Design a protein around this ligand. Structure first.
Ligand code: FES
Ligand SMILES: [K+]
Ligand SMILES: [Mg+2]
Ligand SMILES: [Mg+2]
Ligand SMILES: [Mg+2]
Ligand SMILES: [Mg+2]
Ligand SMILES: [Mg+2]
Ligand SMILES: [Mg+2]
Lengths: 126, 50, 216, 294, 170, 113
RNA sequence: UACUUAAAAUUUAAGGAGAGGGUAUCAAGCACAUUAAAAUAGCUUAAGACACCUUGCCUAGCCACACCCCCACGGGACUCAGCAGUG
């Protein structure tokens, strides 16, 4: 298609089959389809653990730096991937979500202790 | 409490990422100039003419 | 080729359509009219967001304040309730030019110009003011101008340089050793060149779009 | 300090090449692969000799020895320890820089563990992912099963030592422990069964003799070289042993007596040979046959 | 039997044997040769055997040939700068003519190799995609990675159909 | 002094007509490979060229230079040079007049006329 | 996106080395040329002009279309060629 307006972006293009997702990191005009025309492939992401239990990310860090230097935006999942790698700082919401999960498990642990204490009262009743 | 902490993380995160985008923007232009008018570029042009 | 032929009707339509737009341009009194019972704009039927309902009933628009002043308040200081609540430091516009909407039966819609002073720091040139149709403006009294505009700058404490990300730092140190540069200096990013304005900083009204004149 | 000789030293490469030998029929033995109809050229005796010379030039490049290196040291470096991410992930992430023009030993391959530690990928992890993104013909992502001791012993029974080593060079890196393990296992099997001829006129002979010299067990290779009438090779092997062990009793004895040729082998037998009695017997028998017949 | 004389000239292998790749300056190569004579035999053979190979490697260069216009055969190259390089090929073998033009106006082996490598810069083995452009279409092809569900059924717990059933059960 | 966009910055051809004022119709030929036969044949193209002095005659080989701006719809070249004049050829190698594969003036002589 | 001026992505317009469906019982087209005092009588064409017929192609994708009148001021027979569904 003949796009008018838009910018280059670095995003994940979904491949694979049903229940078997696989991603291609690509640089593409933002108005293009998710799996359609791209400019360059900048790596790949396999989100399923392999035989060794490792999720495999490939990053062409030379070309990624080239396209960020030319104005390429980043999708939020790709900003998270660069943070885990260490190439970018950890994303604000990666830290916030980790804090929310910590606060949510603290409640669960406290409730289990309260239930155990309530169960202890049942033990006292016999 | 969480809204304010998150607002500060976004400001500090986005400043760090702007500094890195600028560093990358400079390497692109440095590499381009070296190729266009670097030492090696100039010598080859004259070497061919000679 | 040579079987591609002119399209006169398309040429006629484009020009004619553009001409009608210029002739029947709407005015600010129409585009920004509001029905306060429903908080919906009659021209387009757009219902204002929920977080704006309290202020639309509780605050005034800029030219509602200026229409009551001699010379439409040229030289006066005007601030916004949103700024007063968010920023402790003085934020205001110094009005320089004001073009009321004469069509409005109360001269309560129009455009304005001034010099911005945001968070105590003043710009050097006048530019057009954005969000003039908002219910957020508060005229500063003349007797309170001196106390309002009093600001003492604090030494800046936001860091000027930060470390590099963990992987990008190792790639820099690795390249140093490869090229023969022996040093234990820590790579540092410089944040001074790329410092962001606050999100609520006034934007450029001149480059902003205007809504179309086709009613819904 | 007198530098310890290296494998690639021009002097060592000369001696190792000589003892290895050349055989255009063994070096260019027919490959069991998809075939094409042969071509034919009418050539004079000069043209044929020129073509044989080019064949010997190619056989030299074919016999180039593979590197002999010391075992790499485990990579244990932690780039970061971001504990905020502890418990937020169940599986490790492995990030590989796939920029084309970087040497594989200079690429950054990091691992983000579930605990949050960002560390460098180990040697085993580096080799696996480099095969996945820069696949090399002959190499497989996961270590093959032929290298198990039971499977390797089968290959040795079939006298397929040059194959075990050609596979060990396609799959493993020269500095890896797996590479060193298989080579030292093949070289040890050749010694016990006196199968030194299997690796002659091959690129793997030099490493085998190198391994024996460093481990002070050249006795078997000398006894076999002498019995095959290759006594110039046996003398060169004793020179290489007197070069990598200068302070050895044998090397000091040869300087005292200025021994050369067959004398060098006799000196080794008396001084440092594990089985000196046999080296003299085989050496003596060779002299008797040479003298008696000619 | 392929028609014409020397039908090997009409094979891609023969056309690709040419080694004269002109510099970017070369724009036109006029060939003036005589059809009859004894000193112009090499020129006639050069038109017969070599001109096809030169055109094949230099498709954008205009080769125009004129016959029996002058007493002797010659080659005149027209360059982009406006320079005109005259070559005299009388009493010269066709092989000699090719070597002469290769020396004066032919790209060197080093230059051609650099161009080939630069052409392939954007092909990466790790890249995934169609067979026309990439070695592997999907990561399922890689050894050790989760195989394609079409070839090998996935475990039930890794399936959305199963996960949805449990959520309903909860 | 930017150059033309057209690919044919320099074209050689034969003047097949000269009936337009100050313009010469020139036929150029290039070699094009037949993909089925793998043999080269001649593809001919017509180029209008600006002949300011009307110094061109039918049958003479000429060199054309691409004009920076097209003079008209079809005139996008000018007459750079007349390589060979029809019937008035001058041997490039020796510099002597020739009439076919023969010298009108011997190269041994030095007439200087 | 950087600077208050330079690197990209994405388009648009004018072009042309070369390549590009069928019918020659479609063999002529009829202004299709140049010059620039405004004259000259030229331009394309059996190396296939012009006319007609048929077809999406260039395939990581591209191009054209968006109820109909090539277009869409206007007019008309007045909208699923978005998903599902119906005659
Ligand atoms: S083709 Fe790779 S998962 Fe099916
Ligand atoms: K249409
Ligand atoms: Mg806003
Ligand atoms: Mg008929
Ligand atoms: Mg319809
Ligand atoms: Mg339409
Ligand atoms: Mg439908
Ligand atoms: Mg619709």
């Amino acid at each position: 298609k003949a796009y008018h307006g838009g910018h280059l972006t670095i995003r994940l293009a979904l491949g694979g089959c049903t229940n078997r997702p696989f991603y291609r990191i690509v640089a593409a005009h933002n108005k293009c389809p998710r799996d359609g025309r791209f400019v360059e492939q900048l790596g790949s992401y396999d989100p399923l653990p392999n035989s060794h239990g490792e999720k495999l990310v490939a990053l062409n860090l030379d070309r990624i730096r080239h396209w960020i230097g030319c104005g390429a935006h980043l999708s939020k999942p790709m900003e998270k991937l660069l943070g885990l790698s260490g190439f970018f700082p950890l994303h604000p919401m990666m830290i916030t979500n980790a804090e929310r999960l910590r606060r949510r498990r603290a409640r669960e642990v406290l409730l289990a202790s309260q239930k155990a204490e309530s169960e202890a009262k049942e033990t006292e009743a016999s | 409490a969480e809204f304010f902490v998150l607002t500060e993380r976004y400001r500090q995160y986005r400043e760090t990422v702007r500094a890195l985008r600028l560093e990358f923007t400079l390497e692109v232009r440095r590499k381009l100039h070296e190729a266009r008018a670097g030492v090696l570029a100039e010598r080859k042009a004259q070497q061919a003419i000679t | 080729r040579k079987k591609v032929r002119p399209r006169l009707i398309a040429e006629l339509a484009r020009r004619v359509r553009a001409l009608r737009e210029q002739r029947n341009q709407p005015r600010d009194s129409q585009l920004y009219a509001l029905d306060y019972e429903t908080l919906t704009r009659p021209h387009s039927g757009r219902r204002l967001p929920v977080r704006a309902w309290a202020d639309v009933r509780r605050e005034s628009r800029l030219l509602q304040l200026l229409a009551r002043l001699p010379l439409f308040g040229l030289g006066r200081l005007v601030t916004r309730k949103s700024w007063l609540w968010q920023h402790d430091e003085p934020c205001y516009w110094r009005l320089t030019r004001v073009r009321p909407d004469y069509t409005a039966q109360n001269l309560d819609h129009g455009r304005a110009w001034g010099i911005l002073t945001f968070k105590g720091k003043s710009e050097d040139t006048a530019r057009e003011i954005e969000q003039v149709m908002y219910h957020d403006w508060r005229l500063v009294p003349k007797h309170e101008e001196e106390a309002f505009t009093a600001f003492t700058a604090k030494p800046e404490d936001r860091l000027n340089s930060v470390p590099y990300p963990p992987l990008l730092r190792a790639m820099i140190l690795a390249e140093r050793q490869k090229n023969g540069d022996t040093s234990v200096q820590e790579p540092l990013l410089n944040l001074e060149r790329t410092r962001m304005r606050p999100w609520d900083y006034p934007a450029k009204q001149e480059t902003k779009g205007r809504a179309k004149g086709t009613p819904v | 300090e007198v530098k310890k000789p290296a494998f690639m030293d021009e002097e060592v490469q000369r001696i190792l090449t000589k003892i290895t030998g050349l055989d255009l029929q063994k070096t260019f033995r027919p490959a069991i692969q998809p075939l094409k109809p042969p071509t034919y050229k009418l050539m004079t005796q000069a043209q044929l000799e020129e073509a044989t010379r080019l064949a010997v030039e190619a056989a030299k490049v074919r016999l180039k020895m593979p590197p002999v290196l010391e075992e790499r040291k485990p990579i244990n470096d932690v780039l970061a320890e971001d504990k905020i991410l502890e418990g937020t992930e169940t599986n490790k992430y492995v990030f590989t820089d796939i920029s084309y023009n970087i040497p594989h030993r200079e690429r950054f391959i990091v691992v983000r563990e579930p605990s949050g530690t960002l560390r460098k990928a180990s040697w085993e992890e580096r080799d696996r992912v480099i095969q996945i993104y820069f696949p090399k013909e002959g190499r497989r992502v996961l270590p093959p099963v032929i290298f198990k001791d039971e499977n390797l012993k089968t290959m040795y029974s079939q006298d397929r030592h040059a194959d075990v080593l050609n596979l060990c060079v396609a799959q493993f890196e020269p500095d890896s422990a797996e590479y060193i393990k298989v080579h030292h296992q093949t070289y040890e099997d050749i010694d016990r069964h006196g199968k030194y001829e299997l690796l002659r006129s091959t690129r793997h002979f030099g490493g085998m003799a190198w391994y024996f010299v460093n481990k002070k067990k050249i006795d078997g290779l000398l006894i076999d070289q002498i019995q095959r009438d290759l006594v110039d090779d046996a003398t060169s092997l004793v020179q290489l042993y007197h070069m990598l062990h200068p302070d050895g009793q044998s090397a000091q004895e040869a300087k005292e007596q200025a021994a050369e040729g067959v004398d060098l082998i006799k000196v080794f037998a008396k001084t440092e040979a594990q089985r000196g009695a046999y080296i003299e017997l085989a050496l003596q028998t060779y002299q008797e046959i040479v003298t008696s017949h000619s | 039997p392929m028609k014409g004389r020397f039908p090997i000239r009409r094979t891609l292998q023969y056309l690709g044997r040419g080694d004269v790749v002109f510099k970017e300056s070369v724009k036109i190569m006029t060939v003036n040769y005589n059809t009859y004579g004894e000193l112009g035999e090499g020129a006639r053979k050069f038109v017969f055997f070599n001109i096809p190979q030169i055109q094949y490697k230099n498709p954008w260069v205009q080769i125009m040939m004129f016959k029996n216009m002058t007493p002797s055969p010659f080659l005149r190259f027209y360059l982009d700068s406006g320079e005109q390089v005259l070559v005299d090929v009388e009493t010269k073998s066709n092989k000699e003519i090719m070597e002469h033009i290769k020396k004066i106006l032919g790209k060197k082996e080093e230059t051609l190799r650099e161009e080939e490598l630069e052409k392939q810069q954007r092909f990466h083995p790790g890249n995934f995609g169609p067979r026309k452009y990439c070695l592997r279409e999907c990561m399922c092809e890689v050894e050790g990675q989760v195989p394609c569900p079409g070839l090998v059924p996935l475990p039930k717990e890794m399936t959305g159909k199963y996960k949805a059933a449990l959520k309903a059960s909860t | 002094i930017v150059r033309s966009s057209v690919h044919a910055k320099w074209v050689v051809g034969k003047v097949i007509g000269t009936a337009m004022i100050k313009t010469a119709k020139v036929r150029a030929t290039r070699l094009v490979l037949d993909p089925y036969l793998l043999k080269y044949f001649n593809k001919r193209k017509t180029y209008f060229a600006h002949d300011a002095l009307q110094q061109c005659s039918v049958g003479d080989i000429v060199l054309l230079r691409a004009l920076p701006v097209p003079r008209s719809k079809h005139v996008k070249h000018e007459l750079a040079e007349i390589i060979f004049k029809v019937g008035r050829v001058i041997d490039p190698v020796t510099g002597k007049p020739c009439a076919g594969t023969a010298y009108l003036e011997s190269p041994l002589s030095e007439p200087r006329e």
